[PDB]
Amino acid sequence: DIAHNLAQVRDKISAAATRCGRSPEEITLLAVSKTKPASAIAEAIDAGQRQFGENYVQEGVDKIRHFQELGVTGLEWHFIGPLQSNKSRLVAEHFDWCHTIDRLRIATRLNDQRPAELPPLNVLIQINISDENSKSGIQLAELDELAAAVAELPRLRLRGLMAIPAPESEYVRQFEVARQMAVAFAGLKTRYPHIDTLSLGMSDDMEAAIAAGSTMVRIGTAIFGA
Ligand SMILES: Cc1ncc(COP(=O)(O)O)c(C=O)c1O
Ligand SMILES: *Cc1c(COP(=O)(O)O)cnc(C)c1O
């Protein structure tokens, strides 16, 4: 039951924030609806969920168009999958956020294809903080340079960072890795304007990510099942 699952996830988030001395309002729940049908999303919407993450362009755009045509206003759609050049126009025209900026050319493409009447596309730069096997994300040493270039793009808005850490079961390593992201995030925040989003944490490392300084967790299975 999606409505019950949303309540359960929101409870765990709230507890984790409170335990480490943070206001639960600091933590945004991104409901990851990848591979789930639009009816499942509609249940979540009926239960008050407004922010949804999708990983595949056509699937996500089809959902966006569905809920726009039902005249459901007030939603926020985040693209959190890897972005290919030949599918960036659909992201630029329909999504509100994109978490996976890891090369300048894809951000310039998104900026160029974003209609001017839309709000700027909110973007995070994705860090590969700890995953040997992944080809997504930049190294931290590239961040200052990429952030400067992306920051000039007028149809985008740089809001912070995202990372998918390598899968990790030891709480200690979950926290230490998430802290590396939080340190980078804080350093970015002191020099850049409107840095407010650290997209970090899924169901299995939610507590360490929140304790370390995440502002946004990405939950799929624990909301929608599998
Ligand atoms: C269900 C579904 N919809 C849409 C797409 C669109 O693909 P892409 O993520 O490359 O944009 C994919 C395939 O990757 C998909 O699996
Ligand atoms: C799919 C995915 C999630 C959610 O995964 P679950 O294990 O089902 O909770 C979160 N973030 C990203 C980037 C994902 O691709």
Contact 97, 75 (CB under 8 A): no
97 phi and psi angles, rounded to 5 deg? -135, 155
Report the distance separating Cα 191 and Cα 51, nearest Å.
28
Report the distance separating Cα 204 and Cα 217, nearest Å.
11
Contact 93, 128 (CB under 8 A): no
* Model resolution, angstroms: 2.1
Classify residue 154 by burial, with Cβ atoms within 10 Å: 0-12, 13-18, 19+.
Answer: exposed
Ligand closest to CA 209: 2
Strands 51-54, 76-79: parallel, antiparallel or unpaired by DSSP?
parallel
What would the two tokens of residue 67 be? 């809920």
DSSP 165: P
Contact 182, 212 (CB under 8 A): yes
Report the distance separating Cα 78 and Cα 95, nearest Å.
6
Experimental technique used to determine this entry: X-ray
Report the distance separating Cα 188 and Cα 49, nearest Å.
29
Ligand 1: nearest atom to the Cα of 84: 10
Residue 41: helix, strand or coil by DSSP?
A: helix
Q: Which amino acid is at 51?
A: Q
What would the two tokens of residue 74 be? 């007030």
Write down the residue that tokens 């978490």 correspond to.
99
DSSP 138: B
For ligand 2, atom 5: residue with the closest CA:
220
Classify residue 143 by burial, with Cβ atoms within 10 Å: 0-12, 13-18, 19+.
Answer: middle
**Number of Cα atoms under 13 Å in the Cβ half of residue 149:** 13
Q: Is 93 in the pocket of ligand 1 (CB under 6 A)?
A: no
